[model samples]
Target: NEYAPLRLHVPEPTGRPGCQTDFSYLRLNDAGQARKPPVDVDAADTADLSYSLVRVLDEQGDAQGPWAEDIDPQILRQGMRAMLKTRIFDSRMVVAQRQKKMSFYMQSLGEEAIGSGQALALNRTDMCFPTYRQQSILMARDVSLVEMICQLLSNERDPLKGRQLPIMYSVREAGFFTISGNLATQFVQAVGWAMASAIKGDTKIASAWIGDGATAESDFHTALTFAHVYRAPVILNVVNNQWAISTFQAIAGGESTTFAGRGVGCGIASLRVDGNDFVAVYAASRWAAERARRGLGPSLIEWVTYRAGPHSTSDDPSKYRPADDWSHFPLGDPIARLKQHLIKIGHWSEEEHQATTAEFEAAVIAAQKEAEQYGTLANGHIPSAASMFEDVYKEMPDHLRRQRQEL
Candidate 1:
């Protein structure tokens, strides 16, 4: 009468025919589903080399499962709000740059949900080593907005010794690693951290996020190789957002084909997921985290997303890219998608949306004003002309000491 899978009964070593055995099957970590058949690394043509997966919300914004029925609507709302805040932050920074208030700016516009959902899925103890544009992760985590503004302004209170240029948010206490200005360097560093954690017998996992172009960097490949050899607990998050400044990923040769497939060459588990889908991003991130914890090794996920905005404050896409290319793309706004889902489910309304936006704008204004209190000048306390030499050395050499005195 039972539908459970039938288990074969075997006698114990005592030779009692009906006696049960004491052997137990090990419990797999609560993470990703292991492939029943391992992926073949050398498949020709490589037409269908899709790695990860997509988990989209239904028309009504429901997760579509017996278990999903109990999900809280507030969690989704908060996720939406964080994504919007990132957009706002990016816009504000651009205006600041145009007004000559800041030196540089980078915006996380179209890829908002990808970074936000990924961070939302992980434990705070799990470390995040991200690309410079990924300030949204901290924003989603509700990290202190004032602290972020201080770093942006690079005041005396800036924890990074004012070493990072504007838009690089580096705070270790927030479980976010300092962003190294060198492109693709963080990828290998994250693997190193994961390897160290493994040696210490700690369960914490380290995550690395890079753009599509960074994959071309040798360091990215080295990190993947080391992670595979040592079974390091690190998550490789690749944001495939079309162009790396004026250079389209297509120019790199076959990026659109499948970036995660490259990870297979290094023998790590890999996946390609629909980045715009918040649920898929969450599921993939959690899957990778749990697998890494169990020593199953690193996982690389390529999130297929679009960069609806310019690369940075200094870049203008119109110079190299054509207007026709922009016309063909349709990135249904992430904020609207989440908002529509909420409204459809009777969890939100237009009035509520307007009110939230108004409140957020007021908060943004207040934070900017607060930042100004530290003195809005290049030679202010943080980035004092002398402070430029601070992070340059943990210890100074005799030649440098003499040079400092002469200068």
Candidate 2:
């Protein structure tokens, strides 16, 4: 005989506009606490891995966990450079948007490790279905910064011919698929690509990415179902950045259970990783990639990170969350943390960091100048109107041909 009110629950942020940043909700585990299972470990057997956070860097800036990868010193240096370059590129693009040189832009400010680190672990042949925030993946693969900047400007040199938004890049030879504007579609697309690869007896696997907020989409569930049932060779990544647009992650079912737990329930191997830790991200991505390549079906990984910037050029995060929110985040800045790790190991120094910063600043400046020559959004050096009809079909239909001719 218990009668209680039934009410809807709406998730709220811990720190509102004027409130002090409270990170008490984050129940972080100590580094080295979680065990690293073999790549072939059964999905159902790793329930604890899904709930626990996998971190390799401890407070002392030392690699502490079994997940610590013994990566080459040169590779670590490269990772550092890639992260720096990505940040520099983001800063420049943000400025360009303000100057009205570009119509839109998105910055992947604090979440560089999730893309650059993971890209280092995958083979060149493996395909990645990424979201707009994954420019670092292309950067890690050495995609030219000038080409990227030109695309953002939507100038004559734009590889996409103004078809896609500024940051929605696609490079087939680079093994990077075109980023979809629709939320959660990449998850299902990645599964379908993997299934097709299996049917064709191909060796390359696929990787799909989605944000924590997009997990609520129906496409996310459908993708998981196909990946689980067909044993598709794919790695499904959920980037838990704490906020989606203006809504907190709790609204996406984060407060009730970990996103990685969803994979476990689906009978797929799952792991929740410290996305800020380069070692941790690389290790987890490598593990999932190996599982897929070995025909062990798909693996899901939830990268626990915080979005340090606005969702896009059109967003103003200060209107919802505290201005100093990212500073209070427990994970800390990904670039700073990785740099400290390198310095702690005597592989890097502050002088070198300063020098590299200057070098990259100059490089980006030079690249920006070269890209501007092609024309900015204001100048209208975009592709010809007739070019759209050219790429649409092998042979233009009579109706469209007549329309193009009329124009």
lDDT score, candidate 2, position 175: 80
Q: What is candidate 1's local distance difference test score?
A: 0.70
Question: How well does candidate 1 match the true structure in TM-score terms?
Answer: 0.81
lDDT, candidate 2, at 297: 82
Clashes of each: 3, 0
* Leading candidate by TM-score: 2
**In angstroms, what RMSD does candidate 2 have relative to the true structure?**
1.3
Each model's C-alpha lDDT? 0.70, 0.89
- Candidate 1 residues 1-407, lDDT tens each? 56988897532221112332121211111112222122232222222334433435544554543213334577667777888788887788678778766677888877888888778877788889999978879888878766677677777766665677876777787689988788899999999999999999999999899998777888888888888888899998888876677665654433225677777767777777656656556666776787787777788887877677888887776665553343334334567667877788787789888887777777777877777677454545565655555546788767677777776
Find the candidate with the highest lDDT and give its number: 2
Show pairs that collide, candidate 2: none
